[PDB]
Design a protein around this ligand. Structure first.
Ligand code: NA
Length: 184
């Protein structure tokens, strides 16, 4: 995927996920970033982790080089929170992450890949249309119809388990990046 695009990665880091599965989420994300054409004139990346609260791990406003991003990703510490506040994570995206004051490019399309394995603890609201969300529902505990509503027009990418996530999902994520649409 090589284009002008602002991409957000949102990882659930709750106790229900656990440290091992969160590390698998991280490794999935690292692999995607490696395959993407990340640079100042191309793809820009922001990274968020959420559970009880939301942490901006890497804002758009910081240096948009692959090396700097990937190293910050390695430095991300699993929070292990007692909630899955997906609605709050979405609010961060619309009301913080994709603002020009936080490094967002006004003329670039906005795309979010959100990795979750549990139903939302909180109230969810569909984002403004300009922020495209591709939910990645991992494991048997994902609330699929909830993700379908968050995702529209994007179908959720459903992954059987966190072990499969780093192996299977990057290909699908990059296909969606380049084409602008999911498969079949
Ligand atoms: Na944008």
């Amino acid at each position: 995927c090589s284009m002008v695009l602002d991409v957000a990665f949102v990882l659930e880091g709750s106790d229900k996920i656990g440290e091992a599965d969160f590390n698998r989420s991280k490794e999935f994300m690292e692999e995607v970033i490696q395959r993407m054409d990340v640079g100042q004139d191309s793809i820009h990346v922001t990274v968020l982790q959420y559970s009880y609260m939301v942490t901006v791990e890497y804002p758009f406003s910081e240096a948009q080089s692959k090396g700097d991003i990937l190293q910050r990703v390695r430095e991300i510490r699993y929070q292990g929170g007692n909630r899955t506040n997906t609605g709050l994570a979405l609010r961060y995206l619309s009301d913080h992450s994709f603002l020009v004051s936080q490094g967002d490019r006004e003329q670039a399309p906005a795309l979010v890949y959100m990795v979750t394995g549990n139903p939302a603890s909180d109230e969810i609201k569909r984002l403004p249309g300009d922020i495209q969300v591709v939910p990645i529902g991992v494991g048997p505990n994902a609330n699929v119809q909830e993700l379908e509503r968050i995702g529209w027009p994007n179908a959720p990418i459903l992954i059987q388990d966190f072990e499969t996530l780093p192996r299977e999902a990057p290909d699908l994520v990059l296909q969606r990046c380049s084409s602008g649409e999911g498969l079949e």
